[PDB]
């Protein structure tokens, strides 16, 4: 039997199978406690639990696709949707440090230590995987993954104990203490292997193709319009007909989508109580851009997220500025004009999406509370689904010697750490590209850069990512 | 979210055409970016 490190995407006219492999490292915990919290806010505080476990977060898109493979994805296909996912934990080498006392560290190898692996197929434990935090994976396959520690927030009971105003969320009857050691635990010793084998639900595709037409300009530019438009107001209408030059008063049969607090340049847009509780709903809905290119510069929005760096790394949503969205887009009403910045849902509407890019998420989670709309596509990129890919928790073990009969001899957790290899494969159901009788060469697919500093390549940790994000809508539909 | 680990994305600091985004730590709970919004509250008030 052959032991392999697998990596690489294989394309077809149908789905592409993209696998990657990293080296993980379950470090250590000198205390295997649970370590509740002590936040004690003073102005609704938080209340958590710090589990001694390690989950892994392969959420982003820049791990399954190389930049050459992402460029081959954009210039050849016109949709993408995942349908399968397997996570194999390869060769495990749990080892122990012997503390040379004069050298400090000497690492032998342990055959009796193990690595407790739990897969949460039943969704019993809280899901913290898809929120966009700075522990995902290395972008390049040569660096070592350090998987994050598992922790979660619960709901408790806010008290007010202190001197001035000190609040503290204590435990209530609704609060929960999920001990992960009440489960089934593939114990997974040295050399052991384990798999997950998830299967994605039917999700709508992401349509990696722009438009060569405005949605409000879909008419014959000649010929006028069969209908009329008012001239006088005040009870005596006196409607007139239209010519072909009436472009700003052409009647549309479909409205644009909502623009709830789209502005340009804290908390952004925010719900909450009077002025100071005020939790943020930062990257808007998915129907809104937060960065595009107007006639002179880049407009950058209040509701933007930076994706790195600062100056920021924002995706250029040029396909939302086209179809009647954008940042400083007011709506006007002739009520006895009222400039409004919020646009409502407007029963017949189309708002296409905020575009996915090379570094976006893949799923988040739709929360278990009911009556969702629309929630098929989450913000921060990705899909977002009921029953997401389950979390793979990885503790090592507390091997706890020696004793000597009465004594607390030694360290009693001796010291152990585990290295390994995680090979994650995911298949994406690709759709065929939309037809164009176009005759023009379509624009080329290359990541954006400015001058001299090229995109993904080593320079004199070396490897540098571009200033703008590499979006995915660069071929035209033609609507 | 994980109550540790911060957030991979950023949040604005200055406004007026020069953004100067900054990163986040684990204590930024009131400006954590959510991927799902709450539902409508058309005339929810008290007495």
């Amino acid at each position, epitope marked *: 039997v052959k032991s392999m490190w697998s990596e690489g995407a294989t394309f077809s006219a149908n789905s592409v199978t993209c696998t990657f492999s990293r080296q993980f490292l379950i470090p*250590y915990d*000198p205390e295997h406690h649970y*370590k509740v919290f*002590s*936040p*004690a*806010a*003073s*102005s609704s*505080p938080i209340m958590g639990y*710090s589990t001694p476990w390690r989950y892994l977060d392969f959420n982003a898109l820049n791990l399954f696709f190389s930049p050459l493979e992402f460029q081959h994805l954009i210039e050849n296909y016109g949709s993408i949707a995942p349908d399968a996912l397997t996570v194999t934990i390869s060769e495990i080498a749990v080892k122990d440090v012997t*503390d040379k*006392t004069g050298g*400090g560290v000497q690492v032998t190898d342990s055959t009796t230590g193990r690595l407790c692996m739990l897969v949460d197929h039943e969704y019993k434990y809280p899901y913290v995987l898809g929120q966009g935090q*700075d522990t995902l994976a290395p972008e390049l396959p040569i660096w070592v993954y350090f998987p994050p*520690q598992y922790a979660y927030l619960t709901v408790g009971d806010v008290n007010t104990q*202190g*001197i*001035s105003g*000190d609040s503290k969320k204590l435990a209530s009857e609704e609060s929960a203490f999920y001990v992960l050691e009440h489960s089934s635990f593939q114990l997974l010793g040295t050399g052991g292997t384990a798999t997950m084998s998830y299967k994605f639900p039917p999700v709508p595709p992401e349509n990696l193709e722009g438009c060569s037409q405005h949605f409000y300009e879909m008419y014959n530019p000649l010929y006028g319009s069969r209908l009329g438009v008012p001239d006088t107001l005040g009870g005596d209408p006196k409607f007139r007909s239209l010519t072909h030059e009436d472009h700003a008063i052409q009647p549309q049969n479909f409205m644009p989508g909502p623009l709830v607090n789209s502005v340009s340049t804290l908390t952004g847009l925010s719900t909450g109580t009077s002025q100071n509780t005020r939790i943020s709903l930062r990257p808007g809905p998915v129907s809104q851009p937060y960065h595009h290119w107007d006639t002179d510069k880049y407009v950058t929005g209040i509701n933007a997220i930076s994706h790195g760096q600062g100056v920021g790394r924002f995706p250029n949503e040029k396909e939302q500025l086209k179809q009647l969205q954008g940042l400083n887009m007011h709506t006007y009403f002739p009520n006895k004009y009222t400039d409004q910045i919020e646009r409502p849902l407007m029963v017949g509407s189309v708002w296409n999406r905020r575009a996915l890019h090379y570094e976006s998420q893949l799923w988040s989670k739709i929360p278990n509370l009911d009556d969702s709309f629309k929630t098929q596509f989450a913000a921060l990129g990705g899909w977002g689904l009921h029953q997401p890919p389950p979390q793979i928790f990885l503790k090592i073990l507390p091997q706890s010697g020696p004793i000597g009969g009465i004594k607390s001899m030694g*360290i009693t957790t001796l010291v152990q750490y585990a290295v390994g290899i995680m090979t994650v494969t995911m298949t994406f159901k690709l759709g065929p590209r939309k037809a164009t009788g176009r005759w023009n060469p379509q624009p080329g697919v290359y990541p954006p850069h400015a001058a001299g500093h090229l995109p993904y390549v080593l320079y004199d940790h070396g490897y540098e990512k571009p200033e703008e994000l590499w979006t995915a809508k660069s071929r035209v539909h033609p609507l | 979210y994980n*109550p*540790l*680990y*911060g957030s991979r994305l950023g949040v604005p*600091d200055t406004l007026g055409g020069d953004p100067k985004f*900054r*990163s*986040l*730590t*684990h*204590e*930024d*709970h*009131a*400006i954590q970016p959510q991927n799902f919004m709450p539902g409508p509250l058309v005339n929810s008030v008290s007495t």
Partner: antibody
Amino acid sequence: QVQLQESGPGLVRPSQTLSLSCTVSGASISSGGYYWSWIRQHPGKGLEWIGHIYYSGTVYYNPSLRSRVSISIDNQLSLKVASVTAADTAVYYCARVRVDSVRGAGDNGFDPWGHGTLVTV
Amino acid sequence: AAALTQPLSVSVSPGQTAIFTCSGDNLGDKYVYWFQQRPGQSPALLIYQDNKRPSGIPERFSGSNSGNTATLTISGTQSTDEADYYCQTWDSTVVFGGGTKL
């Protein structure tokens, strides 16, 4: 450069609210991840830590001085230690720590300190 | 740990070293920070993360952290290092040490 200047009221013995303040110069305090500590030092003895506060309201306290002191922020970094029947006057420093990444162990230390005020009790 | 141990004072001459002890339970898997407090002045961050020094601190200060102790070694002590040195860790709140009076 970032400097921290204190404010001392003087001396009040018969159990009044000891109020302090620490205006930060060089950089604003609601500009990102930095704790803001209050640290004591008894003359002839080691240092003592009261508590630190983030700009979004969350404040950690010392478990020994928990029900006496109160840290607050109105771009002022106040401290309102009451019940001064125990005659602790020592010294009151301000200090800033960069907020760590993993929340488990402290990745940074108190690099910018204050000048220190001498309260008497 | 939650209670750092540190002796009272040390005696040194110019031309040699003075190594202090900052004892503590499981201090090897922790960060220890050293603070230089000259008399009449606030402390300054001397050695952070058990080996590193900032730009304002000269290159004659170095430390270590192994097992249940963390040392601070001064290489070639001058006539201006007579200062109280405190070790400080983070046992989930903050833990300050006693201080070796030099």
